[PDB]
Amino acid sequence: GSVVKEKLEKALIEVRPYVEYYNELKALVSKISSSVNDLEEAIVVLREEEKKASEPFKTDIRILLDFLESKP
After folding, report:
1. Domain extents for the chain?
2. Are 4 and 37 in contact (CB under 8 A)?
3. DSSP percent split of the chain into helix, strand, coil, nearest 5
């Protein structure tokens, strides 16, 4: 089961004043969390998703991604 979900929910809140298309990014979060179990996994997904998805949404992917990287 996914522990990463509870981290991504907190991530969404704090990155919300920085990310555009919050509901769209939350939809991506619910998808990636359902695919993965651990944070390190969801991080690798947000790395690939940033590359394949175009901006402005690309930007919002890597804002949330960088936030997971930033916290210990």
Report:
1. 1-72
2. yes
3. 75, 0, 25
